[PDB]
Design an enzyme around this catalytic site. Structure first.
Site, mmCIF file in Angstrom:
data_model
loop_
_atom_site.group_PDB
_atom_site.id
_atom_site.type_symbol
_atom_site.label_atom_id
_atom_site.label_comp_id
_atom_site.label_asym_id
_atom_site.label_seq_id
_atom_site.Cartn_x
_atom_site.Cartn_y
_atom_site.Cartn_z
ATOM 1 N N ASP B 165 0.805 -1.214 0.000
ATOM 2 C CA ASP B 165 0.000 0.000 0.000
ATOM 3 C C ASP B 165 0.842 1.270 0.000
ATOM 4 O O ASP B 165 0.494 2.248 -0.650
ATOM 5 C CB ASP B 165 -0.942 0.008 1.209
ATOM 6 C CG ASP B 165 -0.204 -0.152 2.530
ATOM 7 O OD1 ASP B 165 0.937 -0.660 2.525
ATOM 8 O OD2 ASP B 165 -0.765 0.232 3.578
ATOM 9 N N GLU B 413 0.284 -10.240 5.301
ATOM 10 C CA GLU B 413 -0.786 -10.516 4.338
ATOM 11 C C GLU B 413 -0.373 -11.291 3.085
ATOM 12 O O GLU B 413 -0.642 -10.855 1.964
ATOM 13 C CB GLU B 413 -1.451 -9.205 3.910
ATOM 14 C CG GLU B 413 -2.301 -8.581 4.987
ATOM 15 C CD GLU B 413 -3.078 -7.380 4.493
ATOM 16 O OE1 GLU B 413 -4.112 -7.056 5.112
ATOM 17 O OE2 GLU B 413 -2.666 -6.768 3.483
ATOM 18 N N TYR B 468 -8.566 -4.455 8.547
ATOM 19 C CA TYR B 468 -8.869 -3.185 7.944
ATOM 20 C C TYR B 468 -9.598 -3.583 6.714
ATOM 21 O O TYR B 468 -9.478 -4.702 6.320
ATOM 22 C CB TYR B 468 -7.599 -2.477 7.554
ATOM 23 C CG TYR B 468 -7.769 -1.014 7.297
ATOM 24 C CD1 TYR B 468 -7.806 -0.130 8.328
ATOM 25 C CD2 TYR B 468 -7.865 -0.535 6.035
ATOM 26 C CE1 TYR B 468 -7.950 1.200 8.108
ATOM 27 C CE2 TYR B 468 -8.027 0.795 5.798
ATOM 28 C CZ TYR B 468 -8.066 1.656 6.848
ATOM 29 O OH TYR B 468 -8.197 2.983 6.647
ATOM 30 N N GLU B 504 -4.368 -4.716 12.466
ATOM 31 C CA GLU B 504 -4.873 -3.625 11.633
ATOM 32 C C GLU B 504 -6.384 -3.486 11.754
ATOM 33 O O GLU B 504 -7.124 -4.426 11.467
ATOM 34 C CB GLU B 504 -4.494 -3.828 10.163
ATOM 35 C CG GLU B 504 -3.069 -3.426 9.815
ATOM 36 C CD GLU B 504 -2.796 -3.451 8.324
ATOM 37 O OE1 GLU B 504 -3.766 -3.397 7.536
ATOM 38 O OE2 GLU B 504 -1.607 -3.528 7.941
HETATM 39 C C1 57Z Z 1 -11.219 -0.444 -0.564
HETATM 40 C C2 57Z Z 1 -11.190 -1.523 -1.638
HETATM 41 C C3 57Z Z 1 -11.220 -1.132 -2.817
HETATM 42 C C4 57Z Z 1 -11.202 -2.043 -3.851
HETATM 43 C C5 57Z Z 1 -11.237 -1.492 -5.291
HETATM 44 C C6 57Z Z 1 -11.140 -3.584 -3.691
HETATM 45 N N1 57Z Z 1 -11.106 -4.729 -4.531
HETATM 46 C C7 57Z Z 1 -11.070 -6.021 -3.986
HETATM 47 O O1 57Z Z 1 -11.223 -7.143 -4.818
HETATM 48 C C8 57Z Z 1 -10.863 -6.205 -2.528
HETATM 49 C C9 57Z Z 1 -10.581 -7.625 -1.969
HETATM 50 N N2 57Z Z 1 -10.848 -7.681 -0.550
HETATM 51 C C10 57Z Z 1 -12.121 -8.195 -0.083
HETATM 52 C C11 57Z Z 1 -12.018 -9.709 0.173
HETATM 53 O O2 57Z Z 1 -11.888 -9.929 1.573
HETATM 54 C C12 57Z Z 1 -9.828 -7.227 0.383
HETATM 55 S S1 57Z Z 1 -10.124 -7.284 2.034
HETATM 56 N N3 57Z Z 1 -8.595 -6.735 -0.192
HETATM 57 C C13 57Z Z 1 -7.432 -6.217 0.516
HETATM 58 C C14 57Z Z 1 -6.742 -5.140 -0.042
HETATM 59 C C15 57Z Z 1 -5.619 -4.612 0.596
HETATM 60 C C16 57Z Z 1 -5.176 -5.163 1.794
HETATM 61 O O3 57Z Z 1 -4.034 -4.634 2.448
HETATM 62 C C17 57Z Z 1 -5.857 -6.240 2.354
HETATM 63 C C18 57Z Z 1 -6.976 -6.769 1.712
HETATM 64 C C19 57Z Z 1 -11.056 -5.126 -1.672
HETATM 65 C C20 57Z Z 1 -11.112 -3.768 -2.133
HETATM 66 C C21 57Z Z 1 -11.141 -2.697 -1.258
#
Ligand code: 57Z
Ligand code: 57Z
Lengths: 600, 601
Positions: B165, B413, B468, B504
């Site tokens: 990130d 992660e 988070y 987090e």
């Molecule tokens: C704020 C945001 C924005 C976008 C465009 C996303 N696309 C996803 O497929 C995802 C996948 N996802 C949901 C499945 O549990 C997560 S939690 N992705 C994620 C992204 C960064 C991280 O440091 C941890 C997890 C989340 C997402 C979140």
């Protein structure tokens, strides 16, 4: 007092900037009575130096503290030092500092923006660890530069009041260091560079060596020795030269050697071959009319206060390089020497200024003041003596910097009372004898206009602060334009001096936009600046424009009650307001250092 | 390798942090071929070190640069250093650095957050000046830690892509220093401090000397010698000790001497006598159940990037002391050692973490040409594992003696759903346990790889959960999130019976945004989002820690910033508090220190 800036070769420096120091408040002012310098500071905390102590701790009670604070740190003397002269130097301790090596008081200083040092050889054993304690005081009175007055309420609690706009940050703002020299060493150098129609000539040298025979050699950027000389002074080098020019800043190296029977000392001095002179209504660098563009600045940033920082000057300089600023003024106090070194190397023109701001009780921003500014209970004979001393220490420090083209001995004093001229005339004449090579100035407050001002004739260049014109003109632009122009023309008739407007601008909240082009909007800041520009280009005597301010800075409170603290072209984290791009187009759009044609 | 942190003793150091170095870009990559280290850098400009090179110049073309940059600086070697061993050390050069003294190549390093040093005695003459040139590379591939992939377009212009990130700041982020030692010198020290119901004992050491006889003495804070020992490694000292405790952090001094009899060498090592252990669902410090509060952080600030800075370290600590944070985690890379030093002295608990982040291709933030098998030759392969192990090695050897570090986090992660996952991490988990058995071990879990799908968590001692982005998958609904969260936590409690730390949690919050509707991005929503976690935490016995994401707003990669998630802080980037700062303070100062709230909250 001779001061040369430390460099390395027969000499050596161990920086003590390793920031963390023990730090304590002395709310009961018992620190001196209990001799806190004898042991480890009780109930201390970690603090970083360089840096103001005020904002390091997220604590309001520490930020607004007035009185004594204590710094303490242990340090090793290198083994290899023994046999050498060992000096302990503070580039700046803001307002007042007293220093102890172990249990030996070694130095003392009043004045918060210039270096002070003491030979500490007899009090250290090289290769051992030594305790260093500094008592720092931030109180201002009528004899400090700048002045202020301390108000103690019934409870005995001190509170500092003062008359300048910026916040009264204090602490060890600049580098602390131990440096070494041979027992024979160069103790002072003065260099004057005359030029004559740019094909020719000369570098005059006066040198003081504490205890040695003096030889001198001048090398160019390629290191080709281009001239040599013998003797403690009289040196008058002969050159077909690369001149120090604004925007380039070619530098020679004047290697100064001092020979004993057994010891020698070598000192490298950067030399810029250029001439500065006033001729009529023109300011001449290398006999060429120069036009100043740039800023009034401040030593101010988040967290560190007035604390010095390399990343910050790298960034700020990239910004005024981009925007097309060719100059600035060390607003309301002497700056860290590194900026002057930067300016020397990059060909940046600087107006060097003392900390003599606040000699004025009529600014009117605020809510028990003396009625006579120039009087025994206020600005007196000792104040003048302190003022003169501040001029000495500034000049003695910066006399060899080619970037410095003028000396400003004060900012916005009230010159209407009668004792004003009696105060400044001696200072003005003392300044001219301390350094004849540079024009002299005193920055004018606006309500002390051409009709009412009494001291400006004593100086070479007319620097006008016009910032609060948006207040008196109630924000009307075309009344402001005609009032501005007639006042500038009046000054041109009274003095026939070159004119620099050293402050102009308006308070602007970043992100506030208006279709009505009104106050605090980014659009108003642009229109307000642009009117000053149109007028400047119609007045022959105007040879400089410096915007107030480069970036938003923290203010006294005080000013923050009018709020008050958004005077920048950039924000405090250095983001540009829309006026930054207006200035970039004007300043990069003109021929370098050339006033625009009548008009524009 | 052998890394000891320099202290002045018989040894002396000249900091090269005199920031202004010569600096140049190398867009044609000709610097090595034209041997730039032989002369002064051409068409260079002034740069400050320590500091990222990215934001110093207000230039996007410099900020988004990928490839080699060149640092150069001249320096005098001290006169009394003649006859001594002279070492040139970089506390950190971010990603890759190659160093030349004059014309002599002296060292090389891959890994951007750990020190590397070299004996340069034969290549310097004391009392003279030497030219120092550093070639710095910021490119990431599948074998770097962290991984990334470089894309070269139509015109041959490089462009860096990666999966974490935070923004890919690079440059000389930390202190550079020349330091000296006698030809007989302490080269390594290892200390283990046993405690037993806190009234007594114990301190085992191990010292590696290149060439001398070893004596060892232990002094307390009053400098009273309390124990002594002889031998290169035989010491197992005996004390009725003041133990290193959270919130105070008492420290002893272990003076290590190395004697020839023409030369002697003395090294002071700060020692905190404490025990760290997992027992069931509890985390024990000195045989006492500890509850973590605090933050995931970042090395990020305006202008300087990841550049190190004392004022900022002082202010941030004043803040998380005030707010009641008792701990934090060195999020996604090793931090500058001065912070650990701070934590050791002030009794602050730290989760020390490697730079192994981005081992995931399913995060989904961003727009496009990625391998299909995460664990395979075309991506995370055997050479990658070797670099990963190397990164763990360099971290532990640097931080093994810091009492503030109470556990190691070897990754953050990773996607554990693909096929090669358990085969990749199991050796790493066991290699790390062999490098330091004294500390519990962890691997920070991504939320989508839940209890049912995760394959590696049983291989670790403590369960660190990143929650988070809970707000994203739950569409911002508070009481569905509350119900989903509690069950997942309980599900993890039955699968593993490990103590659980939430490493987090939080939500993106635009500072100064207020709402009557308590909606997204507003400060009121952030408070409400954090509080729902707090209520659930107080209902789960296994939860032994809460660390908020993030301490302050930090710069992100373009992908994250395209959704505009650079406002993850409790504080702003210039360290101004959001309204949640005051909520956490009341909660964290309101609870008994290091004590989990009783069931109910
Ligand atoms: C704020 C945001 C924005 C976008 C465009 C996303 N696309 C996803 O497929 C995802 C996948 N996802 C949901 C499945 O549990 C997560 S939690 N992705 C994620 C992204 C960064 C991280 O440091 C941890 C997890 C989340 C997402 C979140
Ligand atoms: C923004 C602001 C606010 C308030 C409450 C003021 N009261 C004044 O007496 C004055 C006096 N004045 C107008 C001259 O007829 C000026 S220009 N004062 C001034 C204040 C600070 C300076 O650094 C310079 C001039 C201005 C003023 C300005």
């Amino acid at each position: 007092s001779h001061m040369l800036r430390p460099v390395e070769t027969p000499t050596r420096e161990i920086k003590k900037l390793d920031g963390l120091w023990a730090f304590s408040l002395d709310r009961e002012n018992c620190g001196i009575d209990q001799r806190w310098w004898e042991s480890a500071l009780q109930e201390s905390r970690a603090i970083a130096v360089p840096g103001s102590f005020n904002d390091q701790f997220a604590d309001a009670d520490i930020r607004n503290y007035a009185g004594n604070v204590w710094y303490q740190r242990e340090v090793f003397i290198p083994k290899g030092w023994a046999g050498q002269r060992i000096v302990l130097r503070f580039d700046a301790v803001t307002h007042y500092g007293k220093v102890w090596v172990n249990n030996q008081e070694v130095m003392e200083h009043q004045g918060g923006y210039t270096p002070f040092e003491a030979d500490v050889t007899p009090y250290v054993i090289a290769g051992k660890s030594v305790r260093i304690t500094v008592c720092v005081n931030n109180e201002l009175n009528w004899q400090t530069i700048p002045p202020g007055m301390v108000i103690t309420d019934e409870n005995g609690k001190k509170k500092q009041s003062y008359f300048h706009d910026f916040f009264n940050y204090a602490g060890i703002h600049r580098s602390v260091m131990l440096y070494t020299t041979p027992n024979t060493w160069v103790d002072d150098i003065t260099v004057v560079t005359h030029v004559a129609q740019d094909c020719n000539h000369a570098s005059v040298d006066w040198q003081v060596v504490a205890n040695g025979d003096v030889s001198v050699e001048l090398r160019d950027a390629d290191q080709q020795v281009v001239a040599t000389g013998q003797g403690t002074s009289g040196t008058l080098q002969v050159v077909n030269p690369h001149l120090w020019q604004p925007g380039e800043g070619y530098l020679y190296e004047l290697c100064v050697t001092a020979k004993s029977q057994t010891e020698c000392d070598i000192y490298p001095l950067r030399v810029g071959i250029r001439s500065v002179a006033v001729k009529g209504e023109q300011f001449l660098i290398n006999h060429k009319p120069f036009y100043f563009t740039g800023f009034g600045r401040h030593e101010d940033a988040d967290l560190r206060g007035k604390g010095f920082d390399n990343v910050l000057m790298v960034h700020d300089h990239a910004l005024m390089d981009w925007i097309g600023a060719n100059s600035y003024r060390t607003s309301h106090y002497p700056y860290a020497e590194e900026m002057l070194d930067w300016a020397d190397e990059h060909g940046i023109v600087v107006i060097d200024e003392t900390a003599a701001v606040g000699f004025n009780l009529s600014l009117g921003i605020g809510f028990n003041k003396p009625k006579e500014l120039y009087s025994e209970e206020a600005v007196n004979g000792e104040t003048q003596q302190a003022h003169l001393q501040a001029i000495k220490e500034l000049i003695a420090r910066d006399k060899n910097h080619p970037s410095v083209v003028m000396w400003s001995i004060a900012n916005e004093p009230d010159t209407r009372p009668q004792g004003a001229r009696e105060y400044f005339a001696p200072l003005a004449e003392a300044t001219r004898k301390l350094d004849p090579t540079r024009p002299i100035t005193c920055v004018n407050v606006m309500f002390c206009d051409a009709h009412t001002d009494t001291i400006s004739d004593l100086f070479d260049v007319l620097c006008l602060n016009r910032y609060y014109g948006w207040y008196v003109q109630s924000g009307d632009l075309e009344t402001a334009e005609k009032v501005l122009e007639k006042e500038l023309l009046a000054w041109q008739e009274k003095l026939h001096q070159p004119i620099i407007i050293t402050e102009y601008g308006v308070d602007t909240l970043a992100g506030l936009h208006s279709m009505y082009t009104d106050m605090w909007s980014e659009e108003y800041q642009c229109a307000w600046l642009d009117m000053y520009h149109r007028v400047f280009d119609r007045v022959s005597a105007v040879v400089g424009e410096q915007v107030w301010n480069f970036a938003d800075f923290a203010t006294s409170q005080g000013i923050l009650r009018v709020g008050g603290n958004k005077k920048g072209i950039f924000t405090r984290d250095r983001k540009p307001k829309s006026a930054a791009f207006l200035l970039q187009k004007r300043w990069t759009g003109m021929n370098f250092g050339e006033k625009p044609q009548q008009g524009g």
